[PDB]
Amino acid sequence: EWVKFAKPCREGEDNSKRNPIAKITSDYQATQKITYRISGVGIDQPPFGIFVVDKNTGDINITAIVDREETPSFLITCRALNAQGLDVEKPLILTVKILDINDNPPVFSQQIFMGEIEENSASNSLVMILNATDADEPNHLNSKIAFKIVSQEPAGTPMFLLSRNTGEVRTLTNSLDREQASSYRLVVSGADKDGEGLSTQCECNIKVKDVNDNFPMFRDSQYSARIEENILSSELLRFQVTDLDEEYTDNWLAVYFFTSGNEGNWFEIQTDPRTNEGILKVVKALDYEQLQSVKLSIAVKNKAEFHQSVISRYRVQSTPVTIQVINVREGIAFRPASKTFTVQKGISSKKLVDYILGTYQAIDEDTNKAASNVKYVMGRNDGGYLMIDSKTAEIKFVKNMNRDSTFIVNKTITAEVLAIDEYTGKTSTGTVYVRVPDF
Ligand SMILES: *[C@@H]1O[C@H](CO)[C@@H](O[C@@H]2O[C@H](CO)[C@@H](O)[C@H](O)[C@H]2NC(C)=O)[C@H](O)[C@H]1NC(C)=O
Ligand SMILES: *[C@@H]1O[C@H](CO)[C@@H](O)[C@H](O)[C@H]1NC(C)=O
Ligand SMILES: *[C@H]1O[C@H](CO)[C@@H](O)[C@H](O)[C@@H]1O
Ligand SMILES: *[C@H]1O[C@H](CO)[C@@H](O)[C@H](O)[C@@H]1O
């Protein structure tokens, strides 16, 4: 049976006065003489010259300064040899624990940590988990690292905290605001002995991500334009809009839409992706004598839906827009560009004479009523079937029978009608189709 005993030893200190550091004995030494041998680190394994044993007594002396960071403890393998040199006991394992000194500073893995976190996030939300390490004894004050946000260059109102010991950087409040501070540059101070010892520092950069928490609103309370009739445009106006969110993102890209007035789809809006502006297009021309004043209402949205932090606050704008439609001197023309008459079936193609086919009169476009002061006349009257009254624009027949080629085509026959203004000679044309069931 062995009898073990061992002292601790201080790192870096000269323990040459505490010798013997340990003493091992086998009770067999009473009945017979036994010699002691030892092995292991400090002796056979590197480093060497740290431990020696008194072969006769068992007093184990320490012989060199120790570094516990290199050798946190020592496992000495002792043996009790017979007078003839044979073993007499199972090799015991004598442990010498080495006491720690605070001779290693805490150190961050990275000299610059980086993280990202959304905007308006809940308090105590996690950003990043910066790390550090201390080579001194684990679960001991000398390795207990303590972190501290010391400076926040971005502003003067605090937005971050970190766990004293775990080093978790956390959101200090729901008031993270990208369009108040797009990014934060912290600086951390990790220190051992819980904070009142050695220390090193590191830097932290936090990119505050963007969300749609700002509503795009027009830079004006009202818009107005001035365009003539019978004209299309790619740009009548340009609506401006401000959006506080990160630019060139869907959280900032405006999307306009008509809330009213565009009952007839005369207008369309295209958003200028470069300037966010809204281009007011006229895709269908407007007649002055039909509507000389169109009032519209528009509203803006982002291409992205709004965040949960402001979703409820959203209501429509409905900004007034009024386009002045200006009049131009238009002339007389056939309102329908072509009329379709249908001669009855009760007639035979050999007795169509004096069949008043109907009236087909052009109209003044400065009004919308009967064109006054004109002369009505036939044009390309192929076959010579139709004749028009030069005042009432009534159309009679003046030919019967059915010649096949040219005259009659697909049950129909076609002629032009000219309306000449008494004060221009601006000859306006209309085309007269006349269905006929020859059978
Ligand atoms: C182990 O260490 C002790 C103390 O340092 C040594 O004890 C002294 O040894 C010297 C000779 O080496 C004697 O003259 C002294 O009388 C001893 N005692 C004192 C108080 O000094 C011991 O010799 C060492 N033994 C081994 C094997 O290392
Ligand atoms: C921090 O350091 C520890 C110890 O080396 C490592 O295991 C861990 O992965 C590190 N964490 C980082 C770099 O985020
Ligand atoms: C318009 O054109 C017609 C011929 O198509 C003329 O007769 C008229 O006088 C005007 O010049
Ligand atoms: C209307 O169109 C006819 C063609 O059918 C012309 O002849 C006329 O002068 C007017 O331009």
Ligand SMILES: *[C@H]1O[C@H](CO)[C@@H](O)[C@H](O)[C@@H]1O
């Ligand atoms: C009626 O329509 C025809 C073509 O659809 C033309 O040739 C004519 O001038 C009038 O516009």
Ligand SMILES: [Ca+2]
């Ligand atoms: Ca050390």
Ligand SMILES: [Ca+2]
């Ligand atoms: Ca140490």
Ligand SMILES: [Ca+2]
């Ligand atoms: Ca330390």
Ligand SMILES: [Ca+2]
């Ligand atoms: Ca915000």
Ligand SMILES: [Ca+2]
């Ligand atoms: Ca935002």
Ligand SMILES: [Ca+2]
């Ligand atoms: Ca927005």
Ligand SMILES: [Ca+2]
């Ligand atoms: Ca008109």
Ligand SMILES: [Ca+2]
């Ligand atoms: Ca007009």
